[PDB]
């Protein structure tokens, strides 16, 4: 009999409850005070320009039909009760393929406060999409949006509101950072209106300002690129006389650069616009190709083949010495201009 009272309460709530109709349909607009608790910001799949985010999507809305006066002030019910009542058809405008976890049972808590202020949180693996303009990649701060609204209802039917202050609504757990390469600087919240063919939708944009950490690509791409360039410069130090060794150096360096360029592009999506990394690769490609062109010029003027011993020998190429100083310098100035332009 202890649990019979709550059974009679729930059966009284669901008695005559039409879950197809929204609260205040025809009378008032539905205020959905919704906030997010990011349990963990899943890895950003930059290849598909999408990011996974694991959230406790809390959303609350007063429902005058679910009024009760019982021993308990809040009915912490199971997820089965959730499908029995009207929940907003909230969908993520950029949600590509997401799933609400239901293992072991559905992960949606349904809390009914005695006044009818429903609180309906669910756990979600929102794989949302960011329109990314990776032009400054990897040094590219992204405002990855999380736009969510009601698929069916218009702004005249349901309007979405934040539970707390807009800054104090999208909370993120401190330990929940599954971002392998990115770094969540913070979240900027905004609410607006989007025009559609069927009508006007209210939209709750949430720009997760992700700053991509170059530490993965500094060693993945940038260090091998720079080391390949300084290999092509190690060429210059090596004597002009050794034609197979210098030529094999130049060829191996440019071949390396080719494999690095394709490896770099493989990680990112096949966007038209060249990334900042692509410019860095192109300049490095210019440097290695310039080094090989430089040795081809030296060989053009390399009158003698036999090398120094202990009978006139070759002279150290004026181009060799000039490139010995210029190329490191030119690279350094390029690198300083590069990092200053993109980091700042």
């Amino acid at each position, epitope marked *: 009999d202890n649990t019979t009272v709550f059974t009679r309460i729930l059966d009284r709530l669901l008695d005559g409850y039409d879950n197809r109709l929204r609260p205040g349909l025809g009378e008032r607009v539905t205020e959905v005070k919704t906030d997010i608790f990011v349990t963990s910001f899943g890895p950003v799949s930059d290849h598909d320009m999408e990011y996974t985010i694991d959230v406790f999507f809390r959303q609350s809305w007063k429902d005058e039909r679910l009024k009760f006066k019982g021993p308990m002030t809040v009915l912490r019910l199971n997820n089965l009760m959730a499908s029995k009542i009207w929940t907003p058809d909230t969908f993520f405008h950029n949600g590509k393929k997401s799933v609400a976890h239901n293992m072991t049972m559905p992960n949606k808590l349904l809390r009914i406060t005695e006044d009818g202020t429903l609180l309906y949180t669910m756990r979600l693996t929102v794989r949302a999409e960011c329109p990314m303009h990776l032009e400054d990649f990897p040094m590219d701060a992204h405002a990855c949006p999380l736009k969510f609204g009601s698929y069916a209802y218009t702004r005249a039917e349901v309007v979405y509101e*934040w539970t707390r202050e807009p800054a104090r609504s999208v909370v993120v757990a401190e330990d929940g950072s599954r971002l392998n390469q990115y770094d969540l600087l913070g979240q900027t919240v905004d609410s607006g209106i989007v025009q559609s063919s069927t009508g006007e939708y209210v939209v709750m944009t949430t720009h997760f300002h992700l700053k991509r950490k170059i530490g993965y690509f500094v060693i993945q791409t940038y260090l091998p690129c720079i080391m390949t360039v300084i290999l092509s410069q190690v060429s210059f130090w090596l004597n002009r006389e050794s034609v197979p060794a210098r030529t094999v150096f130049g060829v191996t360096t440019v071949l390396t650069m080719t494999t690095l360029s394709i490896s770099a592009r493989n990680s990112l999506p096949k966007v038209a616009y060249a990334t900042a990394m692509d410019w860095f690769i192109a300049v490095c490609y210019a440097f290695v190709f310039s080094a090989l062109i430089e040795f081809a010029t030296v060989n053009y003027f390399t009158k003698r083949g036999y090398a120094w011993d202990g009978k006139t020998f070759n002279s150290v190429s004026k181009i060799d010495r000039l490139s010995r100083i210029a190329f490191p310098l030119l690279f350094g100035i390029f690198n300083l201009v590069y990092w200053a332009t993109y980091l700042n």
Partner: antibody
Amino acid sequence: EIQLQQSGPELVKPGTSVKVSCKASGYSFTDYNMYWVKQSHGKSLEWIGYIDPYNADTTYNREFKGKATLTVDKSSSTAFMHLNSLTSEDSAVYYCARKRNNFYFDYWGQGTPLTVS
Amino acid sequence: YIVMTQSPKSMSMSLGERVTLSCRASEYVGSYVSWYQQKPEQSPKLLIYGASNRYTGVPDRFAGSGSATDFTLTITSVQAEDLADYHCGQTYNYPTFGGGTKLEI
């Protein structure tokens, strides 16, 4: 047709405390949080603290923490503010606002002058 | 806390002239910036909500615009009644208002 009627002006001496009310009309008291705002004469508006009437939760300005206490009565629809340790710097006019959404403060109190001398 | 900085502290625009206000928050506030009219011995009255949208019953002369951190409230055809201090409020965080932009004929 929402009117936030306050207690009125008050004249006091330093050191004592003053309690100022805010009786909302029309919209249900529990539904919307009540924000308290201080208007120093010749100066801008300064927020003091908001009280969520339903569960009586409060949040206060850091500068106003301790000096201002927010208590809400729901049997009679009214939000009260207790101001303690009054000084010359606290002489100003106080309004009670209402937050309708995350955008705007819907309706404001008539105004409660407070004088300390 | 956020601080709202109304740039022109005082104005003396003539009646019917386009008079433009400018307000700037220190940090991001999104679209949650509101403009309020403070007539003397009167409580603030909402004039612009959500930066661009107009509150109900407001005359069309008050045109409000601007993106986050830079906002404008232009009275194209200002009359005698629409000449008083204006404060730009914000609610993206703990609310804070700005110094009144006073006017005089």
